Amino acid sequence: QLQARRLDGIDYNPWVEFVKLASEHDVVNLGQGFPDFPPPDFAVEAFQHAVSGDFMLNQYTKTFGYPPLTKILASFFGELLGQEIDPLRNVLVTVGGYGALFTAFQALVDEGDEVIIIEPFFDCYEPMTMMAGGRPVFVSLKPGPIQNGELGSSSNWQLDPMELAGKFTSRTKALVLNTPNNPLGKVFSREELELVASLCQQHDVVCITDEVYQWMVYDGHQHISIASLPGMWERTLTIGSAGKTFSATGWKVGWVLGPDHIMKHLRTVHQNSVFHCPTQSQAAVAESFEREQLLFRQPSSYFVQFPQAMQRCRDHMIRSLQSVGLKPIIPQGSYFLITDISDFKRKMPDLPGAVDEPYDRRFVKWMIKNKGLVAIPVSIFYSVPHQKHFDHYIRFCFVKDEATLQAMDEKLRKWKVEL
């Protein structure tokens, strides 16, 4: 056998199919989880400055991060977390949030360790756990009671304390928390975070917290970082993404924040994998954060203006999608919302697909080809045994240009005529 056993069961990449199909039809692409408009001017200018400035920025920088970037991350997130952060010992710059996650799993997860993952989960958590020899253990958010004709809210998908507690064992190494959650758009409450924190402390478990959508919060909901809770800094790794912060997903710069006794192991993985991150994008991200720190909580800041603008896009999409009978679940954060397609499953059950194929995957293919709209089937964010049960949601991304939302409405109006 040529390949390593660590690759068992993790070769299938659903994203390649999704991207391929969308490219082959006339569509409004609401499946792409990135903006189709420019990043803010200050961010693009920052990168332009980095590639036209000091010529030595074309050469290697320091292994654990470009010092101006680790300095501003430590200062800014130190303030946000109520934590003294040492840029040398508590910050690691990585190749995006993906690279940060990978670094954490490869540092901490070992053969036989259990890792608690919360469904619906960003799909890589499962195969990253597996490649590190871990055993994924799933806890499932419970969709709230659908009442009195109103739309569901992500806030009401519950993390049951008894279910969660039952998942912790002596083999648990880590719990992966993603808030705001992709795909659901749930913003975890202080009470929910206190529940997770209490169990992590009880069982001596590390919390890997993926906070890439930190700034994308709506309706007055506040992002709370679990590392800011009492006793949690010493057992938490906090992950962010410049791409999701500054609407520049192609920059692929991320970071991990955490205490030295954990971070030293991530540094070991880093120096034995990529060694350096690119210099100039790090300089761009540092300049961008400096801009936002100076304007923090002011009306002209991107972190104030941008979520307000995207909240309007969310509301537009929520209203529009109902015109064809899709039932949105209102998100409190992230780039995304999901819609229940149960009415379609009930009335239109017989879509072509493979024998075991979840309805949502079949429905998305039908929607792309026939209605000209792309979404992502939510079953990809579930463990395989649960996919047959959570097969009736699809994920839309509303972080789109005005023109794209208008184009969406053109497709929806056509669909409504033939309902």
> Under rule CB under 8 A, which residues in 98-157 are in contact with a second copy?
98-99, 102, 106-111, 124, 127-128, 131-133
Tell me the HSE value of 287 on the side-chain side, using a 13 A CA sphere: 19
CA quadruple 321, 325, 327, 333: dihedral, nearest 10: 0
272's contact among a second copy, Na ion, none, with CB below 5 to 8 A by partner kind, is: a second copy
* Residue 170: CB minimum distance to Na ion, A: 5
Spatial neighbors of 384 by CB under 8 A, at least 6 apart, are none
- CB nearer to Na ion: pick between 204 and 402: 204
* Residue 87: CB minimum distance to a second copy, A: 14
Spatial neighbors of 119 by CB under 8 A, at least 6 apart, are 138, 139, 140, 141, 381, 382, 383, 386, 390
Stretch in the footprint of a second copy (CB under 8 A) among 152-160, 267-275, 356-364, 369-377: 267-275
Tell me if 6 is assigned to a ligand binding site. no
Spatial neighbors of 22 by CB under 8 A, at least 6 apart, are 29, 31, 368, 374
- CB nearer to a second copy: pick between 44 and 165: 44
Tell me if 112 is assigned to a ligand binding site. no
- CB nearer to a second copy: pick between 101 and 329: 101
What is the contact surface with Na ion in residues (CB under 5 A)?
203-204
DSSP string, 160-220: -HHHHHHH--TTEEEEEEESSPTTT-----HHHHHHHHHHHHHHT-EEEEE-TTTT-B-TT
Spatial neighbors of 373 by CB under 8 A, at least 6 apart, are 27, 28, 30, 367, 408, 411, 412, 415
Site residues for a second copy, 274-303, by CB under 8 A, read 274-281
CA quadruple 70, 72, 75, 78: dihedral, nearest 10: -60
Stretch in the footprint of a second copy (CB under 8 A) among 31-39, 161-169, 208-216, 378-386: 31-39
Among 147, 170, 272, 300, binds a second copy (CB under 8 A): 272
208's contact among Na ion, a second copy, none, with CB below 5 to 8 A by partner kind, is: none
Q: Is 269 in the site for a second copy (CB under 8 A)?
A: yes
Query: CB burial class (10 A; 0-12, 13-18, 19+) of residue 379?
Result: buried
Tokens representing 47 are 């990168």
* Residue 204: CB minimum distance to Na ion, A: 4
* Residue 36: CB minimum distance to a second copy, A: 7
Stretch in the footprint of a second copy (CB under 8 A) among 46-54, 192-200, 304-312, 320-328: 46-54
* Residue 19: CB minimum distance to Na ion, A: 38
# of chain residues touching a second copy (CB under 8 A): 77
Looking up tokens 């879509």 gives 351
Residue 123 sits at the vertex; the CA angle it makes with 119 and 128, to the nearest 5 degrees, is 110
* Residue 35: CB minimum distance to a second copy, A: 7
Among 21, 44, 80, 195, binds a second copy (CB under 8 A): 44
Tell me if 89 is assigned to a ligand binding site. no
Query: Rg for the chain (alpha carbons), in Å?
Result: 21
Q: Is 35 in the site for a second copy (CB under 8 A)?
A: yes
Q: From residue 297, how far is each of 180, 211, 291, 293 by CA, in Å?
A: 19, 19, 12, 9
* Residue 107: CB minimum distance to Na ion, A: 18
* Residue 193: CB minimum distance to a second copy, A: 22
- CB nearer to a second copy: pick between 251 and 255: 251
Q: Is 2 in the site for a second copy (CB under 8 A)?
A: yes
Query: CB burial class (10 A; 0-12, 13-18, 19+) of residue 9?
Result: exposed
- CB nearer to a second copy: pick between 1 and 147: 1
List binding-site positions.
33, 182, 395
List binding-site positions for substrate.
33, 182, 395
